[PDB]
Amino acid sequence: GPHMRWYPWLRPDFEKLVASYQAGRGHHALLIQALPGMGDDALIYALSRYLLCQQPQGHKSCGHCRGCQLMQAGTHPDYYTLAPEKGKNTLGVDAVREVTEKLNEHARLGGAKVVWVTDAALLTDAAANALLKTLEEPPAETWFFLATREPERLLATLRSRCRLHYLAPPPEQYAVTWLSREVTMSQDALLAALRLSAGSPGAALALFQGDNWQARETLCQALAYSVPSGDWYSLLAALNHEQAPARLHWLATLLMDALKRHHGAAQVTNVDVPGLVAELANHLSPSRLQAILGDVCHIREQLMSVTGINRELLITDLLLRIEHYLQPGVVLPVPHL
Amino acid sequence: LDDWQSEVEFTLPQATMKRLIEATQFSMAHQDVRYYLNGMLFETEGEELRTVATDGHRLAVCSMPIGQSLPSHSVIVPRKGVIELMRMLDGGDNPLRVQIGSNNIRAHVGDFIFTSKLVDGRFPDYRRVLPKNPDKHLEAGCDLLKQAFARAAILSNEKFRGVRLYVSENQLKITANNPEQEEAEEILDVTYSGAEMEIGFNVSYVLDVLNALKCENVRMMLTDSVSSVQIEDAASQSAAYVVMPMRL
Amino acid sequence: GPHMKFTVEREHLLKPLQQVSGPLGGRPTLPILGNLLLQVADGTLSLTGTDLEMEMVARVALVQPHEPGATTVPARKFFDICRGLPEGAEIAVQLEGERMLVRSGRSRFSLSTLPAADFPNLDDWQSEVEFTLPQATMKRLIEATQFSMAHQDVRYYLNGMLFETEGEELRTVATDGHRLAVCSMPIGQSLPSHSVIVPRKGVIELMRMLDGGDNPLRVQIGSNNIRAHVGDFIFTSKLVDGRFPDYRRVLPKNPDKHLEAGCDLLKQAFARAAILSNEKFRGVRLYVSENQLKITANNPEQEEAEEILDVTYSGAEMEIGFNVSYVLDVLNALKCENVRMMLTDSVSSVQIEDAASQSAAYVVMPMRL
Amino acid sequence: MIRLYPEQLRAQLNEGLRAAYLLLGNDPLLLQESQDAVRQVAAAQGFEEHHTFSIDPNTDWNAIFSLCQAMSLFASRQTLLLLLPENGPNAAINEQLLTLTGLLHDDLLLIVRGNKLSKAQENAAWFTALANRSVQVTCQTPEQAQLPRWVAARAKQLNLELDDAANQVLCYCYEGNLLALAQALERLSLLWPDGKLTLPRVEQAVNDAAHFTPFHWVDALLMGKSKRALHILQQLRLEGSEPVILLRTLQRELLLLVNLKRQSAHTPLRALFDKHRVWQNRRGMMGEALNRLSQTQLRQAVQLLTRTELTLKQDYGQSVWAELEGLSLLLCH
Amino acid sequence: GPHMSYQVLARKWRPQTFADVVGQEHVLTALANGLSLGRIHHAYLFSGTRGVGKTSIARLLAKGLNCETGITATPCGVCDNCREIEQGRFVDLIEIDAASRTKVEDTRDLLDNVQYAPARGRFKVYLIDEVHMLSRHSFNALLKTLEEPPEHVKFLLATTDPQKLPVTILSRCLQFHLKALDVEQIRHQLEHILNEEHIAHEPRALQLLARAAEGSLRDALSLTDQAIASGDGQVSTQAVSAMLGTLDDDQALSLVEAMVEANGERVMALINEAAARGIEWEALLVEMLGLLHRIAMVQLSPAALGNDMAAIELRMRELARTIPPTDIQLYYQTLLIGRKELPYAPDRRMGVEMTLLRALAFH
Ligand SMILES: Nc1ncnc2c1ncn2[C@@H]1O[C@H](COP(=O)(O)OP(=O)(O)O)[C@@H](O)[C@H]1O
Ligand code: BEF
């Protein structure tokens, strides 16, 4: 939201990442890798505020000056943001083109010339290759920042120019404590939120304050009828909310916990639904369970990658295939190639 | 906001600035790939202000004394800045207080304030561009050349208006062909003291140079059928022009 | 083929080409519409410019032995070469078959040629009226009637001027929205009754080429072709058909309020009221009282303009809105210092005649402000 | 504000006119018929000048002050027409309409066409000020329940004596637009000026309406006729019908069919037929569609449909027609 | 003053002469001999993976080609033209990023440009980079100027991958496949750089940095900058190990020995501990793959033990003895496919969990 939100565990990293700029040895580029809602956005914002501030205070930005006063108004003439338009999802060549053509001119306020790409994975590869020159060899006093959920999906070249700084999710107990201070409910839900979100406290907050949690509950209840009866089709309404990737991820997490329960493991992710875990283990055969988990992950990938795919057809075929697999006498697929 | 201190300060007559800009404006790049070309170089040294403009096929240098001791400085002002600078200054008022800083330029003209940001970078030197051993020379009245080239440019190609110069002792000749397989040819009586030479120019830049030269007599310097031409006032050395020729 | 030869001085060649440039170029849809036609007749050169509805012919006098023949040449390039050459240099023009050779001084040029692509009869009139309207007559007539006529209007016939010759006088009328113009010029010749509509662009071409207030002109007006012989040169245009409103039905509307007095004072007042006139509804309010006029304007900028004028009046108190632009054109084309103004109603046409003479009359339908 | 129906507008037009007119609806046949009926009414009342404007996002204030200048005092009486954007009035025109509502004269008759608008759009002040002055016409396309009655009445105003079989086939072939119903009715009337619409006469035309998408291609599969739906697909590919639309039809219909297939073991057929609120004329085919195609057939069909839609989506398009007819030939078993 | 006199090593240590280039002797030799002998081709296409030197070799070639001191394989580096081309302010070397200039307007602009005379150098050279993403129209318009240009026009093409080039574009230009830099070459160049810049280091961290960057010297320098940013401006084994998050052979062998004996509970507890320490999962998978490779080598011929470390080689020898080759092959294949599917996994940790739990399939 307004200037986003600082996150308490982020303070160490920023300090390190500002030292390299205090000494003047700062690499112009930077590819911050951080989970969604982790808090990398606040880090990039605070960095840019320090960089473009005419008087950089020790570890702070200014205290008082116009140089970042224009930053707070979000109207600095050097500070550029590259985010896809609210009505679109792919960052076009045109915006990066405008930013890079306007970079060759001098710094308006006599300071740095800071750029920022809001999310690098959204960059079209044509835009990435238009931005390659600007990243590799920028003009003097030009800096960059980028944010990625993962770096491996980026273009082979763009990350090669940049430093791959990493944001480690906070320790499990600290994250649980912070979320408990923020949101109040049973710790099983909080552990499920953190482990589901791969440790991103911001993503756990989004899960709680977002409706999905209740919808998640819905799914659990639906499975509570499906697995004892072998009637999975009735899950359709639960798995279609334009959140098919996230809901399929929750389903795959449940199946992971069941397969863990087979090879009895001390820790599993879903701790709010142990009875569901036990039931899933009881009814389903391990080979069938792994084939079903593979199909769930495959469908989630197919939905996440290709936009414009029909969600209803995919999920319906998935549920029919699962129902087929629960019938004895079927040959299950195995990952290969 | 606190104003930026200036490292280059001077004051100019409106006539001098207008002459410089008219002399070099048609000679600067538009959206060209080389970022440091889309602008005008304002060199200053001694008591002389010099102005350089290039697009890879053209070069206008205009030097005018100022009488004010000035440091050796360089600066590039982009397309829009200089266009609206020329638009801004038109009257006869003496105040032209020009301030050049590290990143921006401001010219005060009475009640109007000029503002733009400089194209960061270093301009190529013009002296390396002007041929150093011109061993062929030509002379003619400025208006005769300008009218001749305007007349011959009528039936040239549309997008790139190439013309061919045949320069010899007997006379000067210029010809033009177009995609419509139309021929135009004409003769001028320039004084030459050499042998035959064939060169290929673009009539657009030549016509622009002649139009903005604004003198009486003009002298051309030449070295080779591929090297650069150096057109100048036959009565002064305050402005020089270069037109890299055309392949045929 | 036949070959042509010319040695034509530049200055006496420019004015014909410069004049005929009207129906030349201007997005030529065909390779033949954008070119000029040359022909040799006895000791004259005819230059024909065509745009499929307006044909402009210029007669250059020939003073040298010139080979007869006709050709079609790119009009723009010919004009440019003939203009750029040094003053007073005779141009030598020859037809090299498919090419057009032209030489002058130390310069040579070649042109692409078209043998015969625009040579039909090109014209056929009826000539109901053949008045020898002298120069000064239609000069003032057309400058007083053109105004700003119909553009994009669905009523096609309102584009062209209405000519009506009767008795010894010709009445020229023009309707466009609120505004309407008419001039009754006393030709003085026993002339038959005739009514015709001429295209607006033809009118502007005739007025522009007209110039030179000395020579009587021959005007042959039919039902589909109109020809005007302006001294040396000839112009011809098509004719718009009927459905035009009768000026005898829109001019006389039984005016009952009469007013007079200065025209340039009204011009200044109208210009100063146009500053604060409604920018969306162009027009201001006119309060009419006995021997007094008041002009008021209230633009959306919440700026009020008011002026008082000494205009004679013996009728009743009135409040009439009007377009400032239309009436300002009326005043400017009236070429007079005093005007007469007849009011009928706030929704009925308002007449404005010249106080100098009845020869010039106008109508503006009032505005509702 | 007087809300009317397209047939009942004429009477109102005869009784008295309103300075502002609104035509909201998707079906353009009644839109244009109402518009030019009002226009000929105005012409019968002396209105001569008729201005029309196409208001778009490009249309703006400089595209509307000429309009405002038009209807002050020029001659006799005139009319105005506008074309509204696809989403209805925006904030850009929210003020233009307010300005236009400030000047209403008998000199100008205001006509407005468009589709249905958001309930917050008529909640604007200009609409409220235009309530007593304007008349709105409903111009949506109603359901198919009244479609045979409406088309029979229309053919009566078109002087066409339809048969029950002719009515059935003409309705069943053109459930897309009143334009199709019209063009079919006038084609039939011109071909046979007598007006008797015998089924053998009406069936010929060129085909069943057009190559359409759903009707017979899906219906033959519902009854299992391979040859019929297969020829229909051949014709669809002959005319270059968009494969994506065919896939969308299959997605929207086979899912309902799958819903019908379930619960049939533990619930009587008709209870499932009316639980889904599926059309009874469609239920008559849904019956044997469920009876013939078993659950395994449904699973295989949906699997191949998903494979096909996948391969089509990432720009491969690996013989979409071959896989579509494969779907058909599975559904015919 | 405050103009950041410091420059990143990835650009400060860019090659400036044909004797400063690390490796690719197979192309430096050809280029230098072509410069000297009098055979120079009008279109050069340097292709190779990231950070191997296509741009640098092209820029050195430009430096040599239009040097005023003849046309030599050794640019002087002190003249004007060398200095501007090094700075990139030369008029006749024009940098075209093919991602931007792919519309027909820009290609028409380029074809208009090529018809004229140079300005300062002998040759006007267009360094077009990332050529493999010019729109088909751009390539078809560029064919003529790439085939038979004027005398003073030469083209230098740089591409990240030759595959996307229209094959006809390949055929008209001179291909130079820049080989990926070997780990030894990268480590030696890093040693030379770090000794030159008076930065303390030790060879172990150099080997780790060379291994992490898969044959890309620019990547090696990027990791060098990351390793000196953290760890008080020095390169050390602990620093690079923490930066990469790499793990010792002991833990990966614990994983493979628990998984080869179907100790699922132990495997999951080890994964939990590894997540608690927060390792890089791809690193875990590469270590497992390496251990399985070594086990396979030991199985094949007893001579090739695990002797690079030879710390817990007892476990490796025992595991080789006690497991048939088929089972090890299946474990390697499973772990490898799982490694291929980390990006597609909803989470890295859960992707590795999927892969390991699937490896647990055999009894
Ligand atoms: N062959 C090489 N020799 C020395 N350094 C190299 C070599 N290849 C790459 N580098 C290093 O990589 C950095 C970038 O090299 P560059 O030539 O731009 O690679 P690219 O082919 O991908 O454009 C150089 O600044 C240099 O430090
Ligand atoms: F980073 Be290189 F130009 F492939």
Ligand SMILES: [Mg+2]
């Ligand atoms: Mg490169």
Ligand SMILES: [Zn+2]
């Ligand atoms: Zn500050």
Ligand SMILES: [Zn+2]
């Ligand atoms: Zn050199």
